[PDB]
Design a binder for this molecule. Sequence first.
Ligand code: MG
Length: 418
Amino acid sequence: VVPASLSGQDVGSFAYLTIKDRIPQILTKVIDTLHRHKSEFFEKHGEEGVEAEKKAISLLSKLRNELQTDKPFIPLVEKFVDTDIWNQYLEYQQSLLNESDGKSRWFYSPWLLVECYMYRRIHEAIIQSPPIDYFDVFKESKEQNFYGSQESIIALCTHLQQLIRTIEDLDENQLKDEFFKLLQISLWGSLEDLKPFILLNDMEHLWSLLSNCKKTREKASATRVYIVLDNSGFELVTDLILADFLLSSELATEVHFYGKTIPWFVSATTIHDFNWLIEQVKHSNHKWMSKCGADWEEYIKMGKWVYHNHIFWTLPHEYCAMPQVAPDLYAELQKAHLILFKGDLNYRKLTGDRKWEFSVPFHQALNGFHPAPLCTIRTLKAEIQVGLQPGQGEQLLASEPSWWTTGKYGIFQYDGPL
Ligand SMILES: [Mg+2]
């Protein structure tokens, strides 16, 4: 049995607040972005870039008004690789509603469906609008984040390369301390001052699993670490940096990355962001960024790093449906020795975005999804968190009602052996 989905039915919930005030703000910014790109669209495509820009804006304005007025969802129309799968899911989701529930709609349906539907409607508007059907309405924002974090990127790249020089000479506890440090940088995006906000910490399980694979690794056999990515800019750098350490420390022999097929939840990494960012680091004029960038493209060339694109990550489906909806992806995940899931949306999809009580075990919240040993590295931006000690979440709600939606708290929450 599984609890109800978080939704905008509870007018006191964060999902309500989010659908009511924040999703319209996202769409307005997107419309602004297309407006501000008029001149660029003209230079590159002539009058018809401008007509396409106006066409897309109208459609996104229609999409906003549906949200504002709680109109029922309509089917997806433009041909695309996941259009039919989407419509099947919508039909299935309507089937879950009884007569009294009416039709799937913005303020009634599961918050997870509501948000993923919205971004997929954004993408439909764009691909409906050639010749700008390539546009990434979030790319300007994602490139800005990279440019605004040059110092931290420089500092992290510098730290990593200093470490690489010495790495051979490290004691296994010294290596473990470096690994925990990089896991913490991967979580937060100073560490001693943030340590009180780690409310669940299974980093020891990550160490035990990986160091045993390393000790017992007989030659020509692989330790695969998969990273299911979240954001671009500095957050992706922290994940690239962690992956590099994983290889340089021989805790892994291959790292596999998964991103999003389409622009998603604003800042989430697509294949174009992944490649663009590694390019900028490689062709940086800073000594340690460039060396990192060269190493990373070299990793990709040798198959030590592999980037994967799969449609499932931009479907509305909970991860419990992956065996049936994307069996090839589940089968691939089963080749991992450890899967790291970054960020809040991955946590929501791993736990169904349901109203679990605080004490429910993570294993049970996963609702059958156990491809391989896995751990969610996540800052809390949603009203859901399982695996807590009794009274722990209750105490936080009483002391700061906002605690699990501000991104202030983080977890390393592991499912697997030991
Ligand atoms: Mg009905």
